[PDB]
Design an enzyme around this catalytic site. Structure first.
Site, mmCIF file in Angstrom:
data_model
loop_
_atom_site.group_PDB
_atom_site.id
_atom_site.type_symbol
_atom_site.label_atom_id
_atom_site.label_comp_id
_atom_site.label_asym_id
_atom_site.label_seq_id
_atom_site.Cartn_x
_atom_site.Cartn_y
_atom_site.Cartn_z
ATOM 1 N N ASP A 1 -6.393 8.446 -0.302
ATOM 2 C CA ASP A 1 -5.894 7.410 0.604
ATOM 3 C C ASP A 1 -4.707 7.964 1.359
ATOM 4 O OD1 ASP A 1 -7.727 5.588 -0.592
ATOM 5 O OD2 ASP A 1 -6.223 4.956 -2.010
ATOM 6 N N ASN B 1 -7.798 9.326 -5.595
ATOM 7 C CA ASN B 1 -8.614 8.406 -6.385
ATOM 8 C C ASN B 1 -9.493 9.187 -7.336
ATOM 9 O OD1 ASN B 1 -8.875 7.011 -3.295
ATOM 10 N ND2 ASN B 1 -7.833 6.017 -5.005
ATOM 11 N N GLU C 1 0.812 -1.206 0.000
ATOM 12 C CA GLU C 1 0.000 0.000 0.000
ATOM 13 C C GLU C 1 0.848 1.260 0.000
ATOM 14 O OE1 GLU C 1 -3.052 0.425 -0.531
ATOM 15 O OE2 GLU C 1 -3.990 -1.517 -0.157
ATOM 16 N N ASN D 1 -8.957 5.434 3.319
ATOM 17 C CA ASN D 1 -9.635 6.312 2.380
ATOM 18 C C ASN D 1 -10.600 7.299 3.035
ATOM 19 O OD1 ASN D 1 -12.214 6.483 0.357
ATOM 20 N ND2 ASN D 1 -10.286 6.441 -0.712
ATOM 21 N N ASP E 1 -15.511 -4.440 9.429
ATOM 22 C CA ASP E 1 -16.675 -3.879 8.719
ATOM 23 C C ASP E 1 -17.429 -4.899 7.870
ATOM 24 O OD1 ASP E 1 -18.085 -1.281 8.116
ATOM 25 O OD2 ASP E 1 -17.451 -1.688 6.043
ATOM 26 N N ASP F 1 -12.660 9.165 -7.808
ATOM 27 C CA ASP F 1 -13.856 9.717 -7.220
ATOM 28 C C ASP F 1 -13.602 10.975 -6.408
ATOM 29 O OD1 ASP F 1 -12.788 8.679 -4.868
ATOM 30 O OD2 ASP F 1 -14.448 7.423 -4.401
ATOM 31 N N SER G 1 -11.781 11.151 -3.621
ATOM 32 C CA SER G 1 -11.280 10.787 -2.311
ATOM 33 C C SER G 1 -9.765 10.602 -2.374
ATOM 34 C CB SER G 1 -11.970 9.520 -1.826
ATOM 35 O OG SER G 1 -11.573 8.412 -2.584
#
Ligand SMILES: [Cl-]
Ligand code: NA
EC number: 3.2.1.17
Length: 129
Positions: free
Chosen positions: A52, A46, A35, A59, A101, A48, A50
């Site tokens: 990270d 990203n 990562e 995110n 989650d 969209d 957003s």
């Protein structure tokens, strides 16, 4: 901060990640390697809108507030900049929520594509833990 492999493994173990939700320590070290290359200051934007953040590339659409991801949540209740610290506490605490989650470590694309199903214990080999 750029961690060494065994230095990060030790920090993750002290913060309770070894076998958290059944994921052995080497899974977490492998995810951090792919990562962020073990760099706490890593960021990636990203498509969209957003971003990270940090050693585990958490995110801003769901997990932290960066002030520039409209309509997003802040489920870890932190500014995203806290995820860039040399102290990994905030990143680990938030990762514990993420892995709980429902999808486990599949939330981390690099883990699913590069760590899952491999010999992850290799990532902690030689470390004094
Ligand atoms: Cl390495
Ligand atoms: Na799981």
């Amino acid at each position: 901060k750029v961690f060494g492999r065994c230095e990060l493994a030790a920090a993750m173990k002290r913060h309770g990640l070894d076998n958290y939700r059944g994921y052995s320590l080497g899974n977490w070290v492998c995810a951090a390697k792919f990562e962020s290359n073990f760099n706490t200051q890593a960021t990636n934007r990203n498509t969209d809108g957003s971003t990270d953040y940090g050693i585990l590339q958490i995110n801003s659409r769901w997990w932290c507030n960066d002030g520039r991801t409209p309509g997003s949540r802040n489920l870890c209740n932190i500014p995203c900049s806290a995820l860039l610290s040399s102290d990994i506490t905030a990143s680990v605490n938030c990762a514990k929520k993420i892995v709980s989650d429902g999808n486990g470590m599949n939330a981390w694309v690099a883990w699913r594509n590069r760590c899952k199903g491999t010999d992850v214990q290799a990532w902690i080999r030689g470390c004094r833990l």
